[PDB]
Amino acid sequence: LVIPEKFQHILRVLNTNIDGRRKIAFAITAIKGVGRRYAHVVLRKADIDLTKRAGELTEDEVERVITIMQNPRQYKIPDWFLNRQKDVKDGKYSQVLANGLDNKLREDLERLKKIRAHRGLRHFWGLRVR
Amino acid sequence: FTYRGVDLDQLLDMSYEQLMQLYSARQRRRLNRGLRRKQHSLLKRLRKAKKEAPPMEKPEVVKTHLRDMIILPEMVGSMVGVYNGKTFNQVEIKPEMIGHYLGEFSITYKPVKHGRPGIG
């Protein structure tokens, strides 16, 4: 097309580096916790065209798509695409995020340890679960 | 402690029908299919064990072979010995294992420690 003057070559979202020369769907896919499918859905609900690139974005669009991806339920994202449906503690329909994935797998591992179930002990030994 | 936005006392006081949406799909299907006689006797033995105990002392263990059980909220604090085919193990039922089976609390196989191989 043309040369965009306001081009962000490297983005930093949720303490995660994003390659700005990649397409918006797959650059958002590049961070942990969201793949191509949820990126396509969150982009279709954000009223943003798919063709334009990640560094070829304005700041309001970036902050609003972050706002969409933070609270899916308020923005009419149905309750089957979400990573965790029914939490053990509070049972809330919510996305998990990048550091949230590490912390949540850590606490799931810890509760499986303290319950002393078969799966937690198998993870403790470090063998195949399924 | 809080399970699915609901604390332990409410779950113990919660009626029998609305546990069919607060469990996982496997447990909801199992509870829909209906429980049979042996673990009904197990549950009554759990009740007789929990009432006939000192308030400060731990209630006495009941030994069983039934690892088919889903854990109900009535079974928290219970002292249950579970068979794994060879020996019983002594399990105190904490209330964070409510969405589990007893079969994962008695592993039926030892972990593998590989030794030096022979003539293969």
Binding site: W125 | N84, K86, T87, N89, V91, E92, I107
Partner: peptide, 14 residues
């Protein structure tokens, strides 16, 4: 260290 009630068959897992 061993818990109070666990059997040796399960104590091998710990």
């Amino acid at each position: 260290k061993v818990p109070k009630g666990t059997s040796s068959y399960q104590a091998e897992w710990i």
